[PDB]
C-alpha cells in the first residue's frame, strides 16, 4: 500500500530556494522518475529522502509508513504489517515522520538504499566478491543464501571477469556496478538511485537497467530514480515528475512528462569546419599491463597506434573497461606505458616521452592539461581559490578574480551565476556545476593539448551543447588540441572529426565519427 | 574560564615555542606554494584526480547507536572515507624554525584527528589525505614553520639533522630532493618527499636569512640562546621530575609537601 | 631606483591599469625582502609599496591613486606587501604616463 508521503516541502539555503512546493506520493511498489534540468534539485531531494545531514526541510515534512519490530528492531515494508515476525511481538504499523519521531529512524535509515552521484560506496581494498559478501552479511540472507546471491548478483552486473580484482583498481562504470550490486543486497524498503547508469555506455546502461528491473520491482520495492536522460526515465517508471529550479513544472504519467521534456530542448550548433596543421603526437606500440601473482594479467592497453594533428578534436569511444582512461592517462604523461614509443612535437623536435625529467616529458607536460574521469576539487577552498590560488595563476591576486569570472563565463555560466559562484565551496555546488568548474580549472591555464575524460555524463543536452560550443570556440580561437573520451554519440558527431573505437585495448579502426558510428551499428 | 599559557621561559626560544603551541597565534607566512605543488612534492596522489577511499562514506556504512561516539564531529576526509597519508619533515639542529617535539606538540594542539610521531632526526604527522593536504599547504609549508634550507619535507632516507650545513646553508640530503638555484637564489624541489624525481621542479622560495633564523628558531644552542640563559624552563623541568618521583614513591598529599 | 648614488632616481612603468601603476623590479637586490612594514588598516592613496618574498612577484614596486581595504598598491594582499614610502607633493602625472616610460623621483624626507 501507500509507502511514503511528501508534503509541501521548501528547502532553502539562505534565501536561495533550491526546492519549493515539491509534493508527491509513492506506494509499496512503483518506479517514479525525477526529471529536471542540471541544478534543478534532484540530488538535493534524493538526499532529503535519504535523511543525510544538512538536508532537513525548512517548511514541509515527509512521512514514512512502514512495518516495525518493537523489540527485535526491524522495520520492513508496510506489507509485512500484520505478520507474526521471526522474533516475538509482530509487525506494528508506524507512520514515521522524518526529521522528527526518533527511536525508529536508525532502523528505518538502515532499510533505505541510495546510489550516490559520482561517489562510489565501496571498501576499495576488499575486491569485488568480498564487498558484496559484506553487503549481504550486513543485513539479511545467510552464508549459503549470501553465497549464491552474490554469484547471481555479479552475473547481473556482469563482473565475472573481475571477481577477485581489487575494487580500488577498478575503472569507473565497474565501480558503479559494484556499488549497485552492494546496494541491492540489503533488501531495502525504497531504492533511491541518483543517475544509476551514470556515464556508462548504452550497452552497459541497458545491462544495469535490466538488473534494476529484475531486482527491485520483482520484490515490490519503490524506486525514486533521477537520470535527466529522458529515455532511461521513460523505460523504467510509470509515474514521473518534472521540476525546474526546484519547482514542479509537470506532474503526471511518465510518458506525458517525458514528452513534455523533449519539447524544451535546443538543437546542436554544428560548428564550421576547421583545418588541422601537422602531426603533433605519435604512439607506436604503447601497451599497459597490470600483472599480479594472484589474479593474472590485465592487458589494459594492447599495442595501440594513434596519431593526432594540432587543431583537432580527437574522440575515443568504446565499451566500459576498453582502456580509454588508461590511454588518456598515457597521453597526459601521467601513467608510464609498459612498452612502446611516445613522441611529442613541441615546435620542431620530438621529445622522447616515457622518460621523466625537465629535459624530457616535463617539457611537454607544461602544456598538457587533463580533466580526469574521477575529478576532484579542493573542498576546503572557495571556487575563486580553486581557479586562482590552488593551481597558481601567473598574475597578481587582484586581477585573478576577473580572469576566473571570464573563464567561468566561457565554460557556459552566465555573468550572474559566475559572480554568485565565486565565493562558494564545491560542497555547495551540484554534480554538473562542479564538473564545469573542474573544466574551467583545466582551461584557465590554457594548455596546448587538452584531454577531456567524459566531459558530459551528468549534464543536460543544453549544458552538453554549451560545453561543446565552448570546446569548439577554444579550439578555433586558441589553436588548442583536444582529445575527448566520451560515450554520447551525437557529441562525437558534432564535436569530433577523427574519433577512434577502443575495444579491449585495441584501436580497431580510425575515421570520421559517422564512419565509426556506422561501424558500431 | 582558564586562559592558557603554553610554555615557561622568557627567552626568544621559549616565546617561539609558545607561538607554535598557541592555536590563536597566526603564523607569519613567508612563501606561496600552490596546493598542486604541495601535492606534487607530497607524492601520494596525482593532482586533479579524486581521492582514493578506504571505506564507504560514513552515511553509507551502518554503525550501532553510540551517544558518546556521535558527540564528536568527524573530519571531512573521514566523512568521505579517504586513505590516511603522511607528511614527514627533517629539521636541522642549526637554528631550524621548527623542531621535532615542538612540531608534534604544535600539531596535536592545533590540528584535529592527527597522528604525530617524534624521532631525533624525523617528525611525521598522519591524517586523512584531503585534510592532510589542506593543513600541509596552509600551516606546514607556507608559514615560518618551514625553511627550505634548514628543513626539508622528506620520507625514506632522513639524515643530516645533526650534520653541518653545506656551502649554501642547506641541510645535508643523501637523496638531494631539493637543490639551490644560484641564478635566482631559490630552492627547488627536484624530487618528491620519498625520492622519485618530479617532472617539473617546484619553487619553494628562498632560504630564510640566518638573522631571522636566530629569531624564529625553537632550539636552544650555546651559540644562540642557551638554556642557562632561560632558568625558568630548567626549573619547570626539575619540578616535573620531582613531582614524578614523589608520585611514584608514595602518591599522597604528605609526600608532595616536599615538592 | 638608484638613489644610493645620485640625488634623482628613475622608476620605469611596468604595468598599468586605471588606478594602479606598477614599476619594474631588479632581480638582483630583491633577496632579503622579508615582510617588514605590512599594512594594518586600509591603504591610503599615494603609497609606494614593494611586494615581499611571500608573493610570486616579489620586488615589484607600485603605487595607486585611490584607497582600498583589501589589496595593496601592487595587486597583492596586505600580508604580501610592505610599505616603503609615499608620494608627498607631485601627483597627477602617474595617470598620464604610458607603459615603459621612466618617471624621476626626489627624496624630500
Amino acid at each position: 500500500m501507500l509507502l511514503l508521503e511528501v508534503k509541501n516541502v521548501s528547502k532553502s539555503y539562505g534565501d536561495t530556494e533550491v526546492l519549493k512546493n515539491v509534493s508527491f506520493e509513492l506506494n509499496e511498489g512503483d518506479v517514479m522518475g525525477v526529471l529536471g534540468r542540471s541544478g534543478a534539485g534532484k540530488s538535493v531531494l534524493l538526499h532529503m529522502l535519504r535523511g543525510m545531514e544538512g538536508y532537513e526541510p525548512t517548511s514541509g515534512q515527509i512521512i514514512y509508513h512502514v512495518a516495525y519490530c518493537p523489540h527485535c528492531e526491524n522495520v520492513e515494508a508496510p506489507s509485512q504489517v500484520g505478520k507474526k515476525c521471526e522474533c516475538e511481538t509482530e509487525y506494528v504499523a508506524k507512520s514515521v515522520d522524518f526529521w522528527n519521531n526518533n527511536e525508529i529512524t536508525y532502523a528505518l535509515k538502515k532499510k533505505i538504499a541510495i546510489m550516490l552521484q559520482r561517489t562510489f560506496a565501496l571498501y576499495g581494498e576488499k575486491t569485488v566478491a568480498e564487498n558484496i559478501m559484506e553487503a549481504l552479511t550486513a543485513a539479511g540472507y545467510e552464508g549459503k543464501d549470501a553465497t549464491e546471491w552474490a554469484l547471481n548478483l555479479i552475473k547481473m552486473v556482469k563482473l565475472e571477469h573481475r571477481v577477485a580484482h581489487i575494487s580500488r583498481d577498478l575503472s569507473g562504470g565497474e565501480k558503479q556496478r559494484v556499488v549497485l550490486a552492494r546496494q541491492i543486497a540489503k533488501n531495502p524498503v525504497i531504492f533511491l538511485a541518483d543517475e544509476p547508469t551514470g556515464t556508462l555506455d548504452p550497452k552497459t546502461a541497458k545491462f544495469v537497467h535490466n538488473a534494476l528491473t529484475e531486482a527491485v520491482i520483482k520484490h515490490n520495492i519503490a524506486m525514486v530514480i533521477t537520470s535527466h536522460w529522458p529515455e532511461v526515465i521513460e523505460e523504467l517508471c510509470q509515474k514521473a515528475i518534472w521540476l525546474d529550479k526546484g519547482e514542479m513544472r509537470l506532474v503526471g504519467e511518465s510518458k506525458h512528462v517525458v514528452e513534455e521534456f523533449m519539447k524544451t530542448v535546443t538543437s546542436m550548433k554544428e560548428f564550421e569546419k576547421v583545418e588541422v596543421k601537422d602531426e603533433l603526437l605519435k604512439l607506436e606500440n604503447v601497451e599497459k599491463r597490470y600483472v599480479s601473482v594472484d589474479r593474472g594479467i590485465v592487458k589494459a592497453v594492447d599495442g595501440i597506434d594513434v596519431s593526432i594533428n594540432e587543431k583537432e578534436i580527437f574522440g575515443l569511444v568504446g565499451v566500459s573497461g576498453a582502456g580509454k582512461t588508461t590511454l588518456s592517462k598515457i597521453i597526459a604523461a601521467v601513467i608510464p606505458p609498459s612498452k612502446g614509443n611516445y613522441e611529442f612535437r613541441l615546435a620542431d623536435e620530438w621529445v622522447d616521452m616515457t622518460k621523466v625529467g625537465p629535459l624530457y616529458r616535463g617539457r611537454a607536460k607544461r602544456y598538457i592539461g587533463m580533466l580526469f574521469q574521477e575529478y576532484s576539487l579542493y573542498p576546503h577552498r572557495t571556487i575563486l581559490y580553486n581557479l586562482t590560488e590552488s593551481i597558481g595563476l601567473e598574475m597578481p591576486g587582484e586581477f585573478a578574480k576577473m580572469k576566473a569570472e571570464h573563464t567561468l563565463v566561457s565554460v557556459g555560466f552566465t555573468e550572474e551565476e559566475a559572480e554568485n559562484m565565486l565565493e562558494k565551496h564545491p560542497s555547495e555546488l551540484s554534480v554538473g556545476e562542479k564538473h564545469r568548474v573542474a573544466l574551467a580549472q583545466v582551461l584557465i591555464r590554457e594548455p596546448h593539448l587538452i584531454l577531456l575524460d567524459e566531459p558530459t555524463g551528468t549534464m543536460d543536452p543544453i549544458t552538453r551543447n554549451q560545453v561543446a560550443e565552448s570546446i569548439q570556440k577554444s579550439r578555433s580561437e586558441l589553436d588548442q588540441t583536444y582529445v575527448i573520451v566520451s560515450h554520447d554519440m551525437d557529441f562525437v558527431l558534432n564535436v569530433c572529426d577523427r574519433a577512434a573505437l577502443v575495444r579491449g585495448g585495441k584501436i580497431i579502426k580510425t575515421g570520421k565519427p559517422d564512419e565509426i558510428v556506422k561501424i558500431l551499428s | 574560564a582558564y586562559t592558557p599559557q603554553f610554555y615557561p621561559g622568557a627567552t626568544k626560544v621559549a616565546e617561539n615555542r609558545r607561538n607554535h603551541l598557541n592555536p590563536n597565534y597566526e603564523l607569519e607566512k613567508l612563501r606561496e606554494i600552490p596546493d598542486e605543488d604541495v601535492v606534487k612534492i607530497m607524492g601520494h596522489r596525482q593532482p586533479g584526480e579524486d581521492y582514493k577511499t578506504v571505506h564507504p562514506p560514513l552515511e553509507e556504512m551502518d554503525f550501532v547507536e553510540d551517544y558518546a561516539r556521535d558527540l564528536v564531529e568527524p573530519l571531512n576526509g573521514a566523512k568521505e572515507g579517504h586513505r590516511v597519508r603522511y607528511i614527514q619533515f627533517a629539521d636541522s639542529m642549526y637554528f631550524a624554525p621548527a623542531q621535532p617535539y615542538d612540531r608534534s606538540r604544535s600539531y596535536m594542539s592545533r590540528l584535529r584527528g592527527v597522528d604525530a610521531g617524534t624521532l631525533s632526526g624525523r617528525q611525521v604527522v598522519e591524517c586523512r589525505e584531503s585534510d592532510l593536504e589542506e593543513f600541509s599547504k596552509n600551516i606546514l609549508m607556507d608559514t615560518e614553520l618551514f625553511d627550505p634550507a634548514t628543513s626539508g619535507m622528506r620520507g625514506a632516507t632522513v639524515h643530516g639533522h645533526s650534520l653541518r650545513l653545506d656551502e649554501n646553508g642547506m641541510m645535508f640530503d643523501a637523496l638531494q630532493r631539493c637543490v639551490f638555484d644560484e641564478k635566482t637564489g631559490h630552492v627547488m624541489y627536484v624530487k618528491d618527499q620519498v625520492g622519485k624525481p618530479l617532472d617539473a621542479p617546484v619553487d619553494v622560495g628562498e632560504p630564510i636569512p640566518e638573522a631571522k633564523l636566530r629569531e624564529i628558531t625553537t632550539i636552544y644552542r650555546n651559540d644562540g640562546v642557551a638554556m642557562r640563559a632561560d632558568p625558568d624552563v630548567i626549573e619547570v623541568v626539575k619540578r616535573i621530575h620531582r613531582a614524578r618521583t614523589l608520585g611514584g614513591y608514595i602518591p599522597t598529599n604528605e609526600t608532595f609537601k616536599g615538592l | 631606483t638608484g638613489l644610493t648614488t645620485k640625488r634623482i632616481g628613475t622608476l620605469k612603468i611596468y604595468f598599468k591599469h586605471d588606478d594602479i601603476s606598477m614599476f619594474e623590479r631588479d632581480w638582483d637586490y630583491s633577496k632579503g625582502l622579508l615582510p617588514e612594514n605590512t599594512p594594518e588598516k586600509s591603504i591610503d592613496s599615494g603609497i609606494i609599496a614593494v611586494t615581499n618574498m611571500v608573493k610570486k612577484y616579489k620586488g615589484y614596486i607600485g603605487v595607486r591613486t585611490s584607497s582600498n581595504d583589501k589589496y595593496g598598491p601592487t595587486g597583492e594582499t596586505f600580508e604580501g606587501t610592505n610599505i616603503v614610502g609615499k608620494v608627498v607633493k607631485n601627483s597627477e602625472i602617474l595617470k598620464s604616463v604610458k607603459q615603459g616610460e621612466n618617471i624621476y623621483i626626489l627624496e624630500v624626507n
Binding site: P358, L359, G362, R363, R366, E394, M395, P396, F399, M402, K403, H406, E446 | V179, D181, E182, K183, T184, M188, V190, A200, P201, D203 | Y14, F15, H17, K56, Y57
Partner: peptide, 25 residues
C-alpha cells in the same frame, strides 16, 4: 580580451627562462 592578453604577456614566468639550471642543458 586585450586586458587578459596583456596580463598573459606581462606576467608569464616561463620556467625555461627563470630556471635555466634545470630546463636548459
Amino acid at each position: 580580451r586585450l586586458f587578459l592578453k596583456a596580463l598573459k604577456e606581462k606576467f608569464e614566468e616561463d620556467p625555461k627562462e627563470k630556471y635555466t639550471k634545470f630546463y636548459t642543458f
